[model samples]
Target: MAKKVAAQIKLQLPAGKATPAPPVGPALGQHGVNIMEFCKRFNAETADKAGMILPVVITVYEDKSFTFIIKTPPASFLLKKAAGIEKGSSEPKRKIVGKVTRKQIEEIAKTKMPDLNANSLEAAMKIIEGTAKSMGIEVVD
Candidate 1:
């Protein structure tokens, strides 16, 4: 028999230093998991992917051996990268904070495929495009 089976739990971590507390701790503790160990490993693995809102999926094995996957940076990151800006417009109507082409959206969708719910590329593109629009980014084709 296999000693371990993978179980995935999704988490939305807060930005910066307070990430693992409150949410990560209580959520895992409720499942009778050791909060500190999980948090330490997760932070270590995703250290490079930090400084913005990030979505994570933690895979907990039967023996409690675990790993985590970080989603691609959100659409906001792409817009920031494209425009060389760190924050969005305070007044979106008069100030354009950032812009991305449809091609950029498509590339981001491909990068996010493993973490997205959709099965096909077309579906994933729509998902990413919608996210961009909702984040007040212009997706110019």
Candidate 2:
């Protein structure tokens, strides 16, 4: 039989660094989930992608057991990497911080397709392009 879900948590944590800290500790501790097991598994799975922030979705069961899924890094993070920028522009509209080619946008869109609500690659590309613009990243030919 399928386990009954107690709660669902969404968190953005640094890859390979899931310490039993504020967010990780308080969140899981309250739900009676094993924080150490999650930390060990998450860190091991994301070690190669260290330094990036990855999103995690955790499902806590009624039995105090839990499972989690790791998602790709956020669009803003990927945009920064593609643009070679340390951060997005504070004034996104007035300051064009960096640029990415259309191809790059397509690549990112493809990577994010499964997680996005888009129906087609074209739709996915549009979503990523919007994210780029919000981050002050210009999309060039």
Candidate 3:
């Protein structure tokens, strides 16, 4: 029953490569949370998903204990990689920098669904499409 909530923070960290540096130190230190403890747990848990950025949400209890849950990369990052673009266009409506097909949308949606809060494939694809659009990535047939 030591679940008295304290602080909650979300981080997008590289899988299997978290460190007690920068964000890990400054962030948890403010909440009286142990830095190395989190780094150790995060590296172990994300070891299997190396090379991808994962969204991890941490719940810090009043006693300085923490629990974290991992989610997949965001649609924005996934979309750019799927379209093979180094970065999204600075002016999207002005110039379209890349194109992604409906087929690709569905594939990414499949990976995105579990954490996207979408109810179906169609819904998930819609979200992905919007992210692509903002990045000046044209949605093709």
Ranking by TM-score: 2, 3, 1
lDDT of 1 by residue, 8-127 (tens): 667876334324466786666655566677767666655654565567677677766666677765455545655335654455453444567788877777777776665887887787
Query: Whole-model lDDT, candidate 1?
Result: 0.64
**Top of the candidates by lDDT:** 2
TM-score of each: 0.64, 0.78, 0.68
lDDT of 3 by residue, 19-63 (tens): 757767778777888877888898888886656567889889888
* Clashes within 3 Å, all models in order: 0, 0, 0
TM-score of decoy 2: 0.78
Best by TM-score: 2
Q: Candidates 1 and 3: which is better by lDDT?
A: 3
Q: Model 1 clash tally?
A: 0
Off by over 4 Å in 3: 1-4, 30-32, 44-55, 70-74, 87-94
For 1-141, candidate 2 gives per-residue lDDT tens digits of 798899976667777888778879888878898888888878888786667668889898998888888776336656766865755545544467888988888887887777766589788788778888887788999
- Candidate 3 deviation (Cα RMSD): 4.3
RMSD of each: 3.9, 3.4, 4.3
Q: Model 2 off-target regions past 4 Å?
A: 1-3, 70-74, 87-94
User: Model 3: how far is 66 from its true place, Å?
Assistant: 2.3
